[PDB]
Ligand binder design. Structure first.
Ligand SMILES: CC(C)(COP(=O)(O)OP(=O)(O)OC[C@H]1O[C@@H](n2cnc3c(N)ncnc32)[C@H](O)[C@@H]1OP(=O)(O)O)[C@@H](O)C(=O)NCCC(=O)NCCS
Ligand SMILES: CC(C)(COP(=O)(O)OP(=O)(O)OC[C@H]1O[C@@H](n2cnc3c(N)ncnc32)[C@H](O)[C@@H]1OP(=O)(O)O)[C@@H](O)C(=O)NCCC(=O)NCCS
Ligand SMILES: Nc1ncnc2c1ncn2[C@@H]1O[C@H](COP(=O)(O)OP(=O)(O)O)[C@@H](O)[C@H]1O
Ligand SMILES: O=C(O)C[C@](O)(CC(=O)OP(=O)(O)O)C(=O)O
Lengths: 1034, 181, 92
């Protein structure tokens, strides 16, 4: 996408980055004025306003300013002060468009003559860069190749035949320095007129330029935050730059151009060729002034990117009211790989967020869309119409594409019945094998679904290349049979192990497709390369075209879906899912072979040919870039030289002289087959100002490149050209019935294709099958916008200031516990955190840590010691004291009961701390429980048991194991969150086992991390500490 | 029992499950210590054929942020005195969201770069001490101690629901045994 | 019922090659369990079937069993046998 930059930006880019041994003069000598500028800011930032004479230029991408009376030559600062008074902020007219003057550029005047003025122009073509020169400014042509350098020896012989001898060396130092500046910053156009080179040096008086805006990832540092001004007649809007910010942050395309904010016809059309066709049809029926915007989205945007694109569009049309009302066209052709379900779910979400002001403006919405998962995309688009009250009319594949334009403008009625309903000739064959570059498993499965339905013997995909993983095998389907396709880290491993592969389908991104395509041209087996990425710079694409011309390799792309040859081979995602393959009967060859620019119209051309003709022989989308790898003529000629092709359908866009070649291909007699062509983009001439479309190559540099003039040229050469795109269907039909009458087309016998089983997830989503869920969970939901802990979102978990004990109640009990119950749980985890290395579990962690094991294994080896004799006294004492308290007996009888059973009371008895020397962990937790808990009946029972057992020995006190056991039970049945059978269940299933384990896991990890820091070696137990009592010989 | 059931799932934690906290902390600190700009770090890891650990979410991309990331990033900016590794990782995140919107800092990569930022910028640790704790696996223990809470909750859930013994279905298993070898 | 008569396809998330049990006989890497015992391979014979999926020769099978007897135990003082004894003495 070549975007024009201002004179100020290009001159600033020249002064910072040119490498000329001749001294460039008047560097940084520019002043920008606005209708909201201060003259004190000019005189303080730039001190040269009074020192020299001055000239003034309107910097709003205006050419021929010196002939329209907008240039003041040789005026003083005081002279240019009153010069801007009737002009800065007033109207103007350059051709047809009209606009204001918010920008003028003030530069010092140069005393020059007509013999001092030169003219340099460097512009890019497909074959290289043309460098121009004219001696009388106010010509010569040199072609520098794609991978060739413009050396200073070459300017003198060719570009300097009429230059004076005393000025040759200073221009050849400048022109060679200008072309390296042209190449480094990725300029596509660079015109300087006039170029005044006096004896003092080189003066750049004017500079009109266009840079390749897709090369922003290469030249981000050197450009800075470059701004692209709109053409004259249209202003810039902040919501236009919001969509342009979303475009540059992904491989998907998101374009928006606001033609008229007061227009009643708003478009949200999917596809950069579909939106052109919708804009042609709206402008065809007299809606040019009411066409509010041109905008497209393609490249499979996400639900969030489509929501951000839709909610920008919805916010633009709800700012001013219209008496007749406003129309939102949500259109598009049948998609190939764009998920219509995720696309429309973003649009439905945006409409529900904006249902208020769309009732105010009487917005009527017409929807026509097909593609992958389009049934529930159109389903939820029909639901949002009735629950919000917005009149939304939904149509699909069966409806014609631009039918809804006539329904919206009031030209055709509403069909209320069908809603909810060295290049080679043979590139592909039935033995064609491909290597797919990247993880596109759905795209590869679409190819293998195509092959089995086309009754192929072998799958198209032989290998896949993904550089970010090791060599493995990916499981796919050969119909109902599971096969494995090998994945390779390196391309050289894939090409060596698969010598039969002749096609590469390159699914690399825009910043990685250049290096992948030049690497695969080092293998002579690959004859066809398909480049899917859109956004590759035009300078890098020309190097792909140049090396493919040397190696004799066909390139389909860039910015294509690929192509389809029914019965033999399809490229990637072309033709959509298998629902669209069988609907369009793309499993058997027909008679039409078509070529097209966009991949969105190729799936529409699949539908148009299928309903009017016996089928498609071979479809190719060449891509929407400025320089495609293979053009229209490279394929229309392969189609002529193919016996299976009977008629050809060509679909082009505005821009380029490629569709002219067909006329000079037909007039010479090379093409003898009936050709039905149509060039889209007839509304750009009928617009006010120049509009650059979603395609990079959809720019009309000349009046010859316009789609109206190209359609007139093909009409003169005997090509069947309809009046518009909606009349393409019966012109293709009327040619087809003409060749059946002549008998050169005979329709074949229809054979039913081999059907495949339906996908499980696709059958489960729309409810034909039921499959039992083998798992049931209640503690955490993660398949949503937010992580949910037992019905509570993760932001509300942190907002309400619950801690680790708060989320422990959510994960383990699924309850909102009170803040004392949460804080008691955390205090239980700190007192059970560690108890030294001498205990049995901490011993086992240290041995496993000293044996060189990881954190997980060392934790585990000691954590598995926890059980009955180590760490079970919390759960044992809780079960012991609750059983005595529930089966209500006095504490004196409980002590006597357990004595006669020969069992010690669990949770009673310390080794050293007895009485008047209490356990401090017990005294911390007992003080908390008495102050904060509302009622502690089991604690008061256990303290009376403790009073009895300290009458026997002073040591027999409540442990920290028995305190936690009787107070955790007291926390469960006396906090209000739990019933009695619920609190008894959690003790029964082992919640207090988990309290010790989660607490003691902290100290065991700390014991692991301690032994790694101390760097302790492998432990062997001493032999003198082991008593060997082995048998004699048994 | 609780101990065996915790353990059988806790031992899955390692490199592919639960290792992205420790992997991203080692990954971003190595780039920041051997001082290179975040643009060069993204280009360095692309040519080595390795994805950046702690970068990239499945569903939450941009203008729909991860809420666990937004809770912890707001805490770290307000309370930490200096976060040089977080600011490095956020500039790496600015570059990777220019490629796909999904390539944001995970909750694995946020915790990894902010735990390192907590160690060397709280005053308790020296630089060789803070680098040792990351080297011996302190962030492995942070995931393991955290995820042990939910695994015990997953154990206690299945005991309450009284779920029977699980056998995997035979139709979900692809038997590719040899012929007679 | 829909999977049996072939209207849907659902991808198998697991792949195995060492044992087939969904038949009339248990199969160890293509070899039935009766032929395992008929041909007098031992524990080292079924180790070659389960771990390598191969018919190993009788010296290779018998060498595997001899490796398991010499690595069977090396006293209680080693680090692993220490940890087993601690966990056994803790009532596990
Ligand atoms: C070509 C296409 C399919 C693949 O691109 P994508 O899905 O956007 O991106 P990828 O999966 O290649 O990854 C994008 C980048 O993210 C990087 N990335 C992914 N995960 C990462 C991680 N965890 N850490 C760091 N980087 C990561 C990848 O390395 C890749 O880097 P690179 O672009 O510098 O090589 C996509 O661009 C597309 O859909 N294009 C539109 C198709 C089209 O133009 N058709 C038009 C005619 S119909
Ligand atoms: C006789 C003697 C050696 C043993 O008594 P002791 O050590 O005090 O107590 P014991 O170890 O028997 O245990 C005391 C009680 O605590 C109980 N007990 C111990 N652990 C317990 C636990 N975890 N839970 C509940 N009860 C427990 C025991 O069951 C015992 O109960 P009982 O007395 O009702 O049977 C001791 O009394 C003593 O030293 N006497 C002095 C010797 C003497 O008199 N000599 C004088 C002349 S030189
Ligand atoms: N820096 C300058 N110094 C002196 N004269 C200038 C300067 N810039 C432009 N002019 C005058 O403006 C006239 C036309 O300006 P320009 O914008 O270069 O071409 P046009 O407006 O015809 O496209 C020329 O005749 C030239 O004399
Ligand atoms: O969304 C759509 O219908 C078109 C598209 O997304 C991409 C596309 O073709 O854009 P283009 O027409 O500019 O080449 C697809 O899925 O093929």
């Amino acid at each position: 996408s070549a975007k024009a930059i201002s004179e100020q930006t290009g001159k600033e880019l020249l002064y910072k980055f040119i490498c000329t041994t001749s001294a460039i003069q008047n560097r940084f000598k520019y002043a920008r004025v606005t209708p909201d500028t201060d003259w004190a800011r000019l005189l303080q930032d730039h001190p040269w306003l009074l020192s020299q004479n001055l000239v003034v230029k309107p910097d709003q991408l205006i050419k021929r300013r010196g002939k329209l009376g907008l240039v003041g030559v040789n005026l003083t600062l005081d002279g240019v002060k009153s010069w801007l008074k009737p002009r800065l902020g007033q109207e103007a007219t350059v051709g047809k468009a009209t606009g204001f003057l918010k920008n003028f550029l003030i530069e010092p005047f140069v005393p020059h003559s007509q013999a001092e003025e030169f003219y340099v122009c460097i512009y890019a073509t497909r074959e290289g860069d043309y460098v121009l020169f004219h001696h009388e400014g106010g010509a010569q042509k040199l072609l520098v190749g794609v991978d060739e350098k413009l050396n200073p020896e070459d300017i003198k012989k060719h570009l300097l035949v009429h230059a004076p001898e005393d000025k040759k060396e200073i221009l050849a130092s400048f022109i060679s320095g200008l072309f390296n500046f042209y190449e480094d910053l990725y300029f596509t156009y660079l015109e300087i007129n006039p170029l005044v080179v006096t004896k003092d040096g080189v003066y750049v008086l004017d500079l009109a330029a266009k840079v390749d805006a897709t090369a922003d990832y290469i030249c981000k540092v050197k450009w800075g935050d470059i701004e692209f001004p709109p053409p004259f007649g249209r202003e810039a809007y902040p919501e236009e730059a919001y969509i342009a910010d979303l475009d540059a942050k992904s491989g998907a395309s998101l374009k928006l151009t606001l033609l008229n904010p007061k227009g009643r016809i708003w478009t949200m059309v999917a596809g950069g060729g579909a939106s052109v066709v919708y804009s042609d049809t709206i402008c065809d029926l007299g809606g040019v002034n009411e066409l509010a915007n041109y905008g497209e989205y393609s490249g499979a945007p996400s639900e969030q990117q489509t929501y951000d694109y839709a909610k920008t569009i919805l916010s633009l049309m709800t700012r001013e009211k219209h008496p007749d009302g406003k129309i939102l066209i949500i259109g598009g052709s049948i998609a190939n790989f764009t998920n219509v379900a995720a696309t429309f779910k973003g649009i439905v979400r945006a409409i529900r967020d904006y249902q208020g002001p769309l009732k105010e403006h009487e917005v009527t919405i017409f929807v026509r869309r097909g593609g992958p998962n389009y049934q529930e995309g159109l389903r939820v688009m029909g639901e949002v119409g009735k629950t919000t009250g917005i009149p939304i009319h939904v149509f699909g594949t069966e409806t014609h594409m631009t039918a809804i334009v006539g329904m919206a403008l009031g030209h055709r009625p509403i069909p209320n019945q069908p809603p909810t309903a060295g290049k080679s000739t043979t590139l592909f064959s039935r033995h064609t094998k491909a290597i797919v570059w990247g993880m596109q498993t759905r795209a590869v499965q679409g190819m293998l679904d195509f092959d089995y339905v086309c009754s192929r013997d072998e799958p198209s995909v032989a290998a896949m290349v993904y550089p970010f993983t090791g060599d493995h095998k990916q499981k796919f389907y050969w119909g109902h049979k599971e096969i494995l396709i090998p994945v390779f880290k390196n391309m050289a491993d894939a090409m060596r192990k698969h010598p039969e592969v002749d096609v590469l389908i390159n699914f690399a991104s825009l910043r990685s497709a250049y290096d992948s395509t030049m690497e695969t041209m080092n293998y002579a087996q690959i004859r066809t390369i398909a480049i899917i990425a859109q956004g590759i710079p035009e300078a890098l694409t020309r190097k792909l075209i140049k090396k493919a011309d040397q190696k004799g390799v066909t390139i389909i792309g860039p910015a294509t879906v690929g192509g389809i040859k029914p019965g033999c081979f399809k490229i990637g995602n072309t033709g959509g899912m298998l629902d669209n393959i069988l609907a369009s009967k793309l499993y058997r060859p027909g008679s039409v072979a078509y070529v097209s620019r966009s991949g969105g119209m190729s799936n529409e051309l699949n539908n148009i040919i299928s309903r009017t003709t016996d089928g498609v022989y071979e479809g190719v989308a060449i891509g929407g870039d400025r320089y495609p790898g293979s053009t229209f003529m490279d394929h229309v000629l392969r189609y002529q030289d193919t016996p299976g092709v009977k008629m050809i359908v060509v679909l082009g866009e505005i821009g380029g002289t490629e569709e002219y070649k067909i006329c000079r291909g037909i007039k010479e007699g090379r093409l003898t087959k009936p050709i039905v062509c149509w060039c889209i983009g007839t509304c750009a001439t009928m617009f006010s100002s120049e509009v650059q479309f979603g395609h990079a190559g959809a720019c009309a540099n000349q009046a010859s490149e316009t789609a109206v003039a190209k359609n007139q040229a093909l009409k003169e050469a005997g090509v069947f050209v309809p009046r518009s795109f909606d009349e393409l269907g019966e012109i293709i039909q009327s040619v087809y019935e003409d060749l059946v009458a002549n008998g050169v087309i005979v329709p074949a016998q229809e054979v039913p294709p081999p059907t495949v089983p339906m996908d499980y997830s696709w059958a489960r989503e729309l409810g034909l099958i039921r499959k039992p869920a083998s798992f049931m969970t209640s503690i955490c939901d993660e398949r949503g916008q937010e992580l949910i802990y037992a019905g509570m979102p993760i932001t509300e978990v942190f907002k309400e200031e619950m801690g680790i004990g708060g989320v422990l109640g959510l994960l383990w009990f699924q309850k909102r516990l009170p803040k004392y119950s949460c804080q008691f749980i955390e205090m239980c985890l700190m007192v059970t955190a560690d108890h030294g290395p001498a205990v049995s579990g901490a011993h086992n962690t240290i041995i496993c840590a000293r044996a060189g094991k990881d954190l997980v294994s060392s934790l585990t080896s000691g954590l598995l010691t926890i059980g009955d004799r180590f760490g079970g006294a919390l759960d044992a004492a809780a079960k012991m004291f609750s059983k005595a308290f529930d089966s209500g007996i006095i504490p004196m009888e409980f002590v006597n009961k357990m004595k006669k059973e020969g069992k010690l009371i669990m949770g009673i008895g310390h080794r050293v701390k007895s009485i008047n020397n209490p356990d401090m962990r017990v005294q911390i937790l007992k003080d908390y429980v008495r102050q904060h808990f509302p009622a502690t009946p089991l604690l008061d029972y256990a303290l009376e048991v403790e009073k009895i057992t300290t009458s026997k020995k002073p040591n027999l006190i409540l442990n920290v194991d028995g305190l936690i056991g009787v107070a955790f039970v007291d926390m469960l049945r006396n906090c209000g969150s739990f019933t009695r059978e619920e609190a008894d269940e959690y003790i029964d299933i082992g919640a207090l086992n988990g309290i010790f384990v989660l607490g003691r896991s902290m100290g065991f990890i700390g014991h692991y991390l301690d032994q790694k820091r101390l760097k302790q070696g492998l432990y062997r137990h001493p032999w003198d500490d082991i008593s060997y009592v082995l048998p004699e010989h048994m």
